[PDB]
């Protein structure tokens, strides 16, 4: 819930992601500490198209961004990202 908040700031603060991209896509993403830890990060997206589009166009950006930072998503000198739909 705190990690959530802040994963997003690393993303917002990233070069290859525009403000509209963050707004339309990334803001809707949400963190999954159940399931997460620590060679993977799990996020929820509200729906399937978001889960899919995000994963297709930014999954590597997220893997990247994550591996290159501390978080609470540990060691994982190469943390994997998995985003899903909610219920």
């Amino acid at each position: 819930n705190n990690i959530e908040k802040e994963i997003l700031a690393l993303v917002k603060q990233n070069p290859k992601v525009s403000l509209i991209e963050y707004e339309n896509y990334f803001s809707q993403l949400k963190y999954n500490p159940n399931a997460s830890k620590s060679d993977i990060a799990f996020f929820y997206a509200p729906n399937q198209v978001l889960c899919t589009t995000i994963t297709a166009k930014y999954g590597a950006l997220l893997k990247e961004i994550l591996s290159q930072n501390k978080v609470g998503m540990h060691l994982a000198h190469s943390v994997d990202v998995r985003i899903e739909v909610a219920p």
Binding site: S18, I20, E21, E23, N24, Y25, S27, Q28, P46, N47, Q48, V49, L50, T52, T53, K57
Partner: protein, 180 residues
């Protein structure tokens, strides 16, 4: 007779006027059309697919739908799961049952989006099937459809408007600008 240059002038004014005059058509009369869009939107946001067909007078509109949902330059848009089902091998001719079975087998979650006259019994049969639809019809084949005056001189304009309404609605909800 009347001079062309004076003619064209009068004509141009009535044209534009008649347009303004009818501008409200869609709100006046607002329908169940919202819920169709709602469900279709949900459908699409759930990953389902859109098999688009059109009567032979509305090919131009099928084309329009295809290129406006997935424009040459996508920019940051999704690639939307949209099928020109008119041109497909599964488009029902003799045996909608096979069309229908194959369709159900190939796709994960198809929906029929048909527009205009239902010109054969094959297509009627499928649009009456239980696969999800989005019917823009001239005659209410089924409870959940969007009814359209066939012989309306402004038919062509209202298809754009409706599509535009649909495109906006879908992206307004995909992008969380609006709550469905």
């Amino acid at each position: 007779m009347k001079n062309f240059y004076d003619w064209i002038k009068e004509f141009i004014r009535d044209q534009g006027e008649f347009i303004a005059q009818q501008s409200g058509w869609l709100e006046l009369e607002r329908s169940s059309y919202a819920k169709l869009i709602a469900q279709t939107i949900s459908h699409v946001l759930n990953g389902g697919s859109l098999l688009v067909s059109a009567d032979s007078s509305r090919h131009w509109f099928l084309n329009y739908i295809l290129s406006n949902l997935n424009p040459k330059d996508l920019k940051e848009r999704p690639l939307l799961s949209v099928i020109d089902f008119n041109a497909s091998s599964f488009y029902p001719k003799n045996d909608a049952n096979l069309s229908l079975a194959t369709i159900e087998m190939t796709y994960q979650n198809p929906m029929f989006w048909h527009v205009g006259k239902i010109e054969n019994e094959g297509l009627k049969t499928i649009l009456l099937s239980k696969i999800p639809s989005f019917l823009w019809l001239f005659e209410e084949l089924k409870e959940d459809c969007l009814l359209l005056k066939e012989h309306d001189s402004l038919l062509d304009y209202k298809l754009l408007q409706l599509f535009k309404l649909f495109e906006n609605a879908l992206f307004s909800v995909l992008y969380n600008k609006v709550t469905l």
